[PDB]
Design a protein around this nucleic acid. Structure first.
Length: 175
RNA sequence: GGCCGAAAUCCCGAAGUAGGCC
């Protein structure tokens, strides 16, 4: 579909983000499962997208009544994958935030975002990196900017905790 | 002239994008 509209960058006033789509299915299949469930729910999905690779995804409604039901619609099993839902975070092109972000490495099974939040008081967001279902030892951390994530990343780099030092791996192309 | 379709260590328009495949 090569059609665009005005207002800003959306097809409707009520939109939303979803997670857990289906990496073993199709994109239209993910949106159709949510479009069919809304047809039975009594909604009116105006549009739906995906979370690149069917990992997460998006949706769009035509009213505040579809957005409120769309909230309760977080119990959607996309082709057998209970998708998650919540306000959209459209800001950086997913791989764009990495520039102003840095992830910690060499962490442990006990450490956590809280501990990173205690060491990275300047970082605004953090994302623990495990093995898709099992603590791995890394933790992403985004700051107010590159110089911010860089000044803190270098300012700590190591943080003696859990009887172990946590390294910090930025997120760019040159690293 | 069709199609095919992965990644980006976590993470929520990456993308239905890149690269690739006939």
């Amino acid at each position: 579909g090569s059609h665009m509209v005005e207002g800003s960058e959306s097809t409707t006033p009520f939109n939303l983000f979803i997670g857990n789509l289906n990496p073993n299915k199709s994109v239209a299949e993910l949106k159709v499962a949510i479009s069919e469930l809304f047809a039975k729910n009594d909604l009116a999905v105006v549009d739906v997208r995906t979370g690149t690779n069917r990992k997460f995804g998006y949706v769009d409604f035509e009213s505040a009544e579809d957005l409120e039901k769309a909230l309760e619609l977080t119990g959607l099993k996309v082709f057998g994958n209970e998708i998650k839902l919540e306000k959209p975070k459209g800001r950086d092109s997913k791989k764009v935030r990495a520039a102003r972000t840095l992830l910690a490495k060499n962490l442990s099974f006990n450490i956590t975002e809280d501990e990173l939040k205690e060491v990275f008081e300047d970082a605004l967001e953090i994302r623990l990196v495990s093995q898709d279902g099992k603590s791995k030892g890394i933790a992403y951390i985004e700051f107010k900017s590159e110089a911010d994530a860089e000044k803190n990343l270098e300012e700590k780099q190591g943080a003696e905790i859990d009887g172990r030092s946590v390294s910090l791996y930025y997120t760019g192309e040159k690293g």
